[model samples]
Target chain A: MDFKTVMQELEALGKERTKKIYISNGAHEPVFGVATGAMKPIAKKIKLNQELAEELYATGNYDAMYFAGIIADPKAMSESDFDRWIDGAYFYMLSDYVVAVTLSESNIAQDVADKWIASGDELKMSAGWSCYCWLLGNRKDNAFSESKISDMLEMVKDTIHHSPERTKSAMNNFLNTVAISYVPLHEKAVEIAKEVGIVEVKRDNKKSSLLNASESIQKELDRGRLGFKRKYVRC
Target chain B: MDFKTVMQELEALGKERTKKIYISNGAHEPVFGVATGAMKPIAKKIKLNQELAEELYATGNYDAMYFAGIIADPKAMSESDFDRWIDGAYFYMLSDYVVAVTLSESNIAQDVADKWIASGDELKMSAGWSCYCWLLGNRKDNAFSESKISDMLEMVKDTIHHSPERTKSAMNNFLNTVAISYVPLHEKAVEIAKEVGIVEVKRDNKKSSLLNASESIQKELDRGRLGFKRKYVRC
Candidate 1:
């Protein structure tokens, strides 16, 4: 569906399905569902209309619009324009979604590090940590400096435990995202994790082993044993 | 125990318990636990140095400090100074806590309406709704104009449905907070609830109709009772 059509459907579904769940006075569910799945694709397929997109976001039902810039057509966006969108998303969504989603969709991971690091809104600063976690998880081509990663890690170390429940969850998710995605970086991540005094529970050990197992699996695949076995089985 | 001894015990408990439960980054757990029950009291008693608090928050363990604010000493603080602290608490904590705690001890409900209305921060604006909700539930004072309530109501209407799972739960807790504190306003609160599309699941015929009927019990009081009762009647 077109962006407009998808928005309409989302609004209708939101009103219909969620009319009774009244607790707060805001639109978060529809925004999250639509933005996370449907809206991203629609934004990709359609022309980039930042004005219209922002207008829709102001409608408040489209809370997902905050994150839409992360998935919008970067080809049409100026650096400055993308930065504002990133800032908007960073502030609005705060530390809600996993770091992977933010990094997977846009240049925000690097842009934030390069441009917005000095902007001292705690949320914005926290976004730097989140985006770095995303980068550590997804981006292999970009060679991030140790100091940069350390800076992000320090922020994580400093803020992860004292945050509200949601923020803490996001911080944990970010650490796990980094550890799992960048095995080579695990030692540093773990060190930072330790500095923050995160207890090493069974889950943490299991997660560590899971990362190792994934590496073993990758090695076996690279060596062609898995591929040969699959071919032989197929034959 | 004396405050100093209690503070020491809490610190030790924070460290030791974090070692067992949080392993990876336990320092970051908000000084307060989530925005309810025992945690609120716990936070009130344990005062971390600001630098330490900031450090712990940055590390990922202190997950609920968003509700932290300075309680003014009535004898020591000037009127202006106390007001500033209240304002600071409302702004910072609201930004972080979102749908979490109400600053009732700080008298935020009484002062927030006119002093900080145009800040336009989502949580602050929502605080207006919360303050209004509190007034309606407790004071039966709808001092704000209908237009203001309508605006606040509209904001609530748009965002209330799609809150994150935790946020939704928090909002429910907040509603219950209002409900229990002010029984007389329950019906009027129900009107706002209905406007926001909260279905009235059961009718209230009289005070003794069903003191223990699950639905007839004031929802917030029910939560409080459940929590208290659970403490005494644990399996």
Candidate 2:
């Protein structure tokens, strides 16, 4: 049937159960999941009901949300609309246990930076720092920006050294990004390091070695910074 | 030692370990805990550190960033000076983590909202929805404007429900807030809930019994419907 009809039926079903039906997994489950699910039929019936499309997905699980998010092109949405949706999607993903589970089960260290750099929300943007650090600790590719990386470093420094407490995982990610990426982008990283009062410490053998190796590769990819072609390089 | 001397020392020390030291801990810890063993003495040297404060008691072993936040307060600091210190603190915090641990641990049932809310830099502001949610969840004694709450609920509803994936915890918290406080502020909540088409669903017993109970209490309070005086209430 139509969207209005489906809503009416859902409401009727809800009232008949004294509104207790929603508590059941059956009721809570997305209508799209059923063979005769209300949402599937309704979605097929409607013609580009963006509002309904979102409502349907919101009713489903995280996988459904991710599926819908990837399908719903950011380019199609208005900036404000996109911001709301992106924020909502990001918030939902972060709140779920799935994120921790997925991160733990997957080869996160290998693909985190790429996934984050390609994500559409602030979470994704921030993930870029952690991904870089993981790669650094593993001694993988090191050709990244020193200045941007230092910005992340300075942010964590206050959190670790001067702030009241430590967020170990986030701190690890932030430090990893700076330490590993700084080697390739030494000039900018060193400038930031000096400004933040860490230049002397970073001059040690371990840091210097990483920076030297990164700089060597950075020179080869100068023209392809932030480009798709540069991301696939195996160094 | 005076604040200036402490500041100078921190500046010097900060330069010394720029990329050398890494703070260890997870996001759930208090921001001040990061520097306790090593950084505590130095932090105490800053004037008005309030080491034994009750507020500090509430936050155990979290992170030093939260503690630094108090130091960064404008009330205790000259505006420009405090701003610079705060900025430095943020940069330091961000260096290791994607999202601020303080915002993340603000505590909602869902991880998505925490992640999404913490992902942005506007946590300090009063107007942001995350701030509002944090206040609602953490501060029970305070009253909130129904209009503002409605706006926040609507924004999340439009974004979360309309999107592809649902954030259960964020949505539950959002809905619970409506069920409890929103129902008490009946007119405003009704208006917004109706606008969002979740009015009936929100009032469902299994989904929002606490909200229903709270509404009853609020109604009585608003009408001065108390059965007895506080000084002489006989069962």
Candidate 3:
């Protein structure tokens, strides 16, 4: 129930076989192989332990850092906390999913993401993209002007493939999020997707792939899953 | 091309939220949260690089460890190799799924299970139970005495609730494997299932629940999933 016991159980849950599965898929090593279901209950028990979350995140254990995000109060987190979480994140899971998602709900979300996008660091850029996507997905209707969203679509169109792989993926994701987040943008995103054809990500492997933005939007459209506004895209 | 660069990309691909999700699902963190779908391609390109797999596994990263297991040729590994992997396993996904699967069809399986089950360590016992299941799943009927399996069923029926939670889960799984792996034991497993009822796991949180053994087997029976043999359960 406490951090000590929690970590021990986490470590005990570590398995070499599945560990490699995630690593090969792109995870950092020495992870505790605990599933999200197991962690959810633990987080519920902890029930938003902000200080504990900070301490755990600082521990640099991936699970602890992730669990920190679940238990952290985004509104309560200070600027310093956000900076610390963002400055030395272990990887994407911590940066994009946890930090960016949490930041998306905070007052500083737009400010931080806007600043981070220009830094040119892959991990930080990932967070920036995630935040941009989350904002579009979760914001109230009319939060951004039609022109602002249109401008973002243009940025995505011009040089997405030229950016880092994660950034490219995020751009695609952000576009998709915008498409579905606002009913107004649906036609525009579909227009972009149709015009651009399939946007591809340039991965280090070169063989790597994620969902093509056009295909993703088409699927969402075909399945009637579009315009799904949300308050939070990350847990 | 090399593991270093491969890892960089993997790390880049991570999302903290999903990283914990994997942990809760039996993965270690610091993982890329890359889907198994992606890893399979990489494995295909490497085409069972046993040496590379072994080296990756030794990196102490969970995802790499799992990848190594996928590409490593169990048949080529020496006795000492198994010893190193099994003895050093932090927990079950490594031991039960990885080590147990490799050893299930190996030359030294029962010997290791025989020793491990006797050690009384929770995780070792977990491995012992898993190996027994895998053995029955893959081994010829005559290879292991039927009575030994019969004894296991009786022990499980009488005391599965008393074991560690993971071990108990494995015991429940072993029954499914045993029941389906050997047609002769279908009714036997059903008999135990009816008696065992719901197998309750001890947890720090009391609200937690695992599948009821009876319910699981009944669902399988209702769906006609009984009497199917598998080489192993995990991917």
Candidate 4:
């Protein structure tokens, strides 16, 4: 489908209830509130169109950007291109679910994410850590360096408390993912999770949510999901 | 004086008007509102007391923290020690004036400041860049690398606009300082300054100030203070 037609379809699929939900979750204006599951037909039609995805992502509309991820050709994008996409990610929804998810499927994912994780910009850093969560959950264990992942676990343990709220959330997920997905670092990740207990992530006019990675990792462990990996990283 | 006596003296010197000024500039409670210059007598009495300075700084009182900077032995401070001080700096006054000023007098100033500049924390980054301004304005020209200063100018030119408000202000000062004080990079700094043009720094509940690096540098140039260096970095 073309950009205009896809946008029209997205707009048509948008619902008032879903729009409010998205806004409450920090999605701003220029949003259509088209649910992700509803975009399957469009994604099936477009398959993977880098050109159309770029056009859609540039629109600054929440649904369009999300849709852009659904159709983006991850391997076709360069490091600078992902930088542009992450720059436009103003909130967690785009940063984690869309941009990071798309980045997980790319060959340059780890390299680009390494830069983003170190960028110090909150959303970009969140996307970078989130990208790793996506990678670890789906990719083979041999795809990553064991020592490097262990060091990242250490870095997260050391700096997560002072990190931006979104980055903290992503880092917590990183700890949990490392425990559940990466076999070599599972014990260390679990230990670090316990030590870095009770991360309080503040929210606007809302009661802050407490994240306990240790408990979450244990629950997954109890369910025998240890060393679990996803069949696919992207939607 | 001892820590208890110093705290009592700081409390005695507190002024209602000065407290309001500090509060308005983002300082919180536990502050005595003692003017920086007012602490000179105490600083002289307790000259270069790194031990006492730690106690005062740990108090988290604005006046105490400011006085801590006055009595701090910068040379005795390690990189981690500066990190601790910068972490306690809640606002620009402490970050830029107190922490940055002390950092300027340290032999490890540039190295420690380099880490803070890369930290991505707003106040930390502000202090980092502000330290360079203090260093450039006070230290001899031969103390720094021409290439490093040139690269820093390039970084400020590329990133200042998107940097945090306080960091933007410090980065602008950095540009102006390099243009005025660093002779080898004077022309390049001036070129970058002109290219960067105007920078708008946002203030809380007040009109934002527009900083024109080119104009500021030109004024200093016209005054024939091109290689201006301070006799002492600290007050």
Candidate 5:
């Protein structure tokens, strides 16, 4: 689809109720209010449109930026482009779902996740942690070190209670990924869960935890969904 | 503090960015932008003043609603009063945190949850699910039937992936409540989680889940906190 048509389609797709919900979840102004599922077709139609993705995201419209995630070519994307993209993200949906997911699939995902996780900016680190979690799940062929993954879970066991608001959330989510995705590591993950105790996070001035480790991992064990490798978690 | 003085406290407590964040969480304009932490002192002072809570919540101000939850006398509140509170709630803060929690602690909570869960209105149903979850969590001494809670979990298991947006979230949340809060039902909840497989809800076009029954219950089991009535589930 042409960029102009895409924008018009997005404009037509915008719903006031959907937009209201997005605003609560961290989206700002200039949204078209398209449902998340609607963006998939536009993304597929415009699949891997490198130049078009950049132009759409740069338009600074929330719906356009959402669509950008669907069409952006990870293989064709540059590190600097991702850096710019990260800087532009102000909402949770755009930063983590749109930017972080795409960034995870990129060849430079490692560098971006590494540097962003350490940034002082909460938004950058939120994306980084999210990217890291998804990367761990989908990029198993990346030869992720068993010990390294365990070590990070160990770090979370120690540091998550005191981490930044969203980072703590991202970190706990990663723990969920580790437990559920890495099947062979069940015993290791379960032991790590015991040590992690309760993973506490402060969300909206209230405490919340990620999904539980022991029980879910056990469910995977009982049901035999452990060690399952997902074909993709990009969306 | 009196209603007039309480409004003064909120004005003194409001922060620009924080208030901005609540806009999407269902707050309207004329907000005081006060953080919950800042509101604690004022809520602590006002305590559960029914007359004052009536006055504050009636103003239709967002911060006042937050304050009303803190001070509203749930024990003495009538079912009709809860109905009034439910009618006035426009966001999660008011619906779940204020009205729902207090309603859960009230004598008529069961009736509310049962009725609200059957409602077509999103907010009422969300509160209904939320109220049911907490009522189950805190009403342990009341002796709920195994088949009753189990049947509901089964219902959610079969229906949640296809349920409405916010209600799906509330359903999963209820599952989380079941897994963590109910003692003998922990194993049943785990089985339900396995049966449920993965829950996917589109919150602002972003997918999220409540508790993976296995993991959360396992966490509780590991820590010996299963069947623990959390001091409070409300903020």
Candidate 6:
């Protein structure tokens, strides 16, 4: 489907309550607040369209940006291209689950993530860390460098406390990812998670929630999640 | 009791197993490995002996330093005196449970702790944060500045990740202390604890243990320990 058609369909699917929920989480005006599940049928028809994804993403609509991630040609997107997308990511929902998720399917995922992690911007840092989590979850353990992942854990252990709120959440998720998905650094990651402890993430007009990397990994481990790798990074 | 008499008494109370345990925890030569409970008898006889405490502490013996904390007159000790004692604390047992514990009973506890926390030395920082924990646990909530404790939690939130190993342990304890013992900042401290998460402290030739501030607070809260205050800083 074209961008115009998709926008019409998305607008038709938007609900008032969902829009309010999105707004509560820092989404701005222009968001249709369409549920991710509700977009699946649309995504199935418009899959792998980089031009349409960019067009929808540039509209500055929250739901459009979200759906853009679903149809974006991840493999075709370059570092500069992803950087542009990240720049448009106004909040964690778009930065992490969308941009980062899209980046994870790219060959340049790690490179882009490394640059973004060092960018010092909140959402970029968040996207960077979240990108690593996605990469670790889907890629084979051998896809990552043992030393590099070890070093990243050390970085997360040393820096997560001082990280921005959104970045802290993603860093905590990255810690869990390495512990459960990357076998070579599993022990090191778990140790760092225990060291890192419960991460407090404050949300927009909501009670702050805690993130426990150690406990998260332990839960997955108990369920035989050790070295668990996702078969797909996207539908 | 005289310094010589106290030293002799401590030596007499020392057990080989306890000596080995102390050695395992980084105690050096001249340590008699006298347990705190066993030394209570001697401490009872030599209650509030600053002179003897000084002499014992100067011996560079772990057991003596531990005992010195028990017998030292906290009120008589000046800021310089506490600084000197903190300099002598070789490990967490002495830095946290001994020097910090003794400092907690002093009128200038907060002043001295602020200085130590600013010091880059691991044990000093550990002592500093630990002293605050002791103060919070024993003092009334009104004795503290709500803003100051809140600021310290903010500092802990930002800096605990890059903190030294021993300092990290004490900082974690401080998070727990503020959440459980200081009623004025209970909600704030609990929020910070949830944000701070698990702290990992590496020991001397031992397995590292996890410290979860949020869980630690919740356990105490479950046991009806909110606003809990200790009657004494020393046994």
- Per-model TM-score versus the true fold: 0.35, 0.23, 0.49, 0.50, 0.50, 0.50
Indicate which candidate wins on lDDT: 4
lDDT of 6 by residue, B9-119 (tens): 889977675577677767779877664545646777876888888888999988787888888899999988987888788778788888888888899999989988998
Write the number of the candidate with greater lDDT, choosing between 2 and 3. 3
lDDT of 4 by residue, B1-235 (tens): 8999999998997777567767767889998777554565677788689999999999999788888888889999999899899999999989998899999989899998899999989999999999999998667789899889888999998999999999999999999998877767878988998889899988787667688888777645422345556522232
RMSD of each: 23.4, 22.7, 23.6, 22.5, 23.5, 19.1
Model 1 chain A worst lDDT run, 10 consecutive residues: A226-235
In candidate 5, what are the lDDT values of residues B76-125, reduced to their tens digit? 99878887988998866677667887887777777777788777777788
Write the number of the candidate with greater TM-score, choosing between 1 and 4.
4
Q: Give Cα-based local distance difference scores for all models.
A: 0.38, 0.33, 0.68, 0.84, 0.70, 0.80
| Weakest 10 consecutive residues of candidate 2 chain B by summed lDDT | B226-235
lDDT of 2 at A15: 26
Q: What is the lDDT of residue B219 in candidate 5?
A: 45
User: All models, DockQ values?
Assistant: 0.01, 0.01, 0.01, 0.01, 0.01, 0.01
Better structure of 1 and 3 per lDDT: 3
Candidate 4 falls in which docking quality class? incorrect
Worst 10 residues of 3 chain B by lDDT: B219-228
Using lDDT as the yardstick, the better of models 1 and 4 is: 4
Q: Which stretches of candidate 2 lie over 4 Å from their true place?
A: A1-108, A111-235, B1-5, B13-143, B147-235
Local accuracy of candidate 6 as per-residue lDDT tens digits, A46-144: 768999999999999988888899999999998889989999999887898789999999989988899999999999999999988888866767788
